[PDB]
Design a protein around this nucleic acid. Structure first.
Lengths: 130, 130, 127, 125
DNA sequence: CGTCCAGAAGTTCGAAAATCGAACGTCCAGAT
DNA sequence: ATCTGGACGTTCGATTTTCGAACTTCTGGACG
C-alpha cells in the first residue's frame, strides 16, 4: 500500500539501550534519566549538523544547561541529578571551561558484559513455557 | 573492523515513539508509562513466536498481571495505573476474560497528527545558525 | 569509548524488504530492481523535506529522468527496465504530468502472504 | 491501527551500507556482491544463535560452499567471484569446515561528506 | 436462576521518595 | 599566585505526590 507520512512519524522513536535493564551497573539509573539518555542519543545527529566533532572524530554537545532544561524539559536540580547519576557510570563525561563558554558534553555508549547478554537473551526469548 | 557480539546487544533498544512528547493527547502518560508501552511494544515479537495472533491477523497479549508485574517490574497498584493510563488515552485495550482465565491485551500504534509531524520535525532540523 | 561520527555513517544503509526473496511474485525482480527499490525507499524520508507529501499522507517523487539516472547511477535504457519491473509487481506506480513536467512516482509498500511469513520465519533459524 | 503480522514481516529487510555506493574503495563491487553482503550481515543474528562467537567477541561463519550456495542462491562459480570481490575490499576473510569472518565497511573523511550531502540533498523552491 | 473461583481492579494508611526554593560551594580562564 | 565573573553544582529540609501489603469488591459464562 502507500507510504504515508502520517505513519512515517509513527516509526520515529527514542532508543533506550536494553542493557539499562540488565546490568546492575545501570540499575541505579532511574527512568527519568533513561529517557534523558535517549533524548541526548537523539540529538547526537543534530550535533553532527553543527559540526560538533573533535579531531579524533567524536560527537559532543556545546549545550548550555539552559538549553538542556528545555531539551530534557525540567528544572535545575533535576538536570543535575541526571548528569551526576549518568556521569557515575560512564554514560556521560564533561569538562568545564569557565567564563561564558558553555559546558562541553560527551555522551557515551554503555558497556555490555557477558552477564548482560545472557539476561537480554530472556527478555527476547521468554516464550510460553516459563 | 569485526562484528563484536558486544556491539550487537549494545544496539538493542526499547523504542519510544517521539510523538509521545508532542501530542497533548499523549501528555498524560508518565515516564513510567511511556517506558512500559515500550517494553510491551517490543514484546510483540515474543507474541508472534507464541502465535498470539487472531483472525484479522492482529497481535495480542495473554499476560497475567503476575507476568506483567515482572515485565514492567512493579506491583499491582502501579501496574494498574499504567494499564489504565495507556487504556484511557486509547493506547491499549484489553478484553475482560472472565471465568478463571487471565487478561487478553491489544497494544496499539499512536495517532500522529498534523501539529505532531510539525512539532517533531522542528527538533530534527535544529541546525544551529551559520 | 565515545560516539564517533565515523561509526554513525558507517551504520547508514539501504533497506531491501526480505519479502523480495521469498514471495514467488517477487521472483521476477532482478538484483538491480531490488536495490533500486531499496534506494528509492531511502529517498522517502528526504521527499518529506521537499514537501512532496500528498494531501492523504501519501509520499511521491518528482524526480526527472535525469535526477533518476543520477540517483540510480545508470543509463536511460536501464532505468525504464527497472521502472517497468517494479511496475509489474505493484511496487511502484506511475502517473503522468504532461509535456515537460517529470511524471509523478508513488512508491508502494510490498505485499506479504501467509506463505511469505512462514518462509521468512524459517530463514531466520538453523542448526 | 492494530499491530498486524503483515506490517511486522513487511518491515523486515536486508541492509546494504550506503558507503558502498559512495566510497571509491568499494566502488569495485557488482550489485550481486552488495546484496550478498547484506544477506551475510542478516546471518549474524543466527551466528550468535549457533554460538559462532569468537573469544574476542567477534562473530564468524562456519558454512561450506555447499551451504553458502543455498543461502545466497547462486552457483559454484558465482560464489567464488562474489567471495573474491568481497575479500579484496576488506569486507570478508577466511582461514582455509571453511571458516569466514565478516567485516564492517571502512568510512573515510570524504565518505561522510558525500553521504551527508546526499541524505541532506534537498532542492530549493 | 444461582453455584462456582482465580484473576483483575479499586480502597485505606503509613512509609518512601521525587520536587523546589533559595541560599551556599565550586570551578574555570585571563587580567591584575 | 591571587581577585573575580558568570556559569555549574550542591547541600537541606518541608510540602506534595507516589508506592506497597493484605484485605475487600468485582468480573465473566457454561452447567446444573
Amino acid at each position: 500500500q502507500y507510504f504515508t507520512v502520517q505513519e512515517n512519524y509513527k516509526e520515529r522513536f527514542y532508543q533506550i539501550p536494553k542493557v539499562f535493564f540488565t546490568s546492575e551497573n545501570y540499575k541505579n539509573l532511574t527512568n527519568d534519566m533513561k529517557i534523558a539518555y535517549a533524548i541526548l542519543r537523539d540529538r547526537l545527529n543534530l550535533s553532527i549538523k553543527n559540526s560538533w566533532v573533535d579531531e579524533d572524530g567524536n560527537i559532543y554537545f556545546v549545550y548550555s544547561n539552559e538549553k538542556l532544561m528545555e531539551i530534557l524539559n525540567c528544572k535545575k536540580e533535576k538536570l543535575t541529578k541526571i548528569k551526576k547519576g549518568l556521569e557515575n557510570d560512564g554514560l556521560l563525561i564533561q569538562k568545564r571551561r569557565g567564563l561564558n563558554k558553555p559546558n562541553i558534553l560527551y555522551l557515551m555508549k554503555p558497556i555490555v558484559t557477558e552477564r548482560d547478554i545472557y539476561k537480554i537473551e530472556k527478555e527476547e526469548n521468554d516464550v510460553e513455557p516459563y
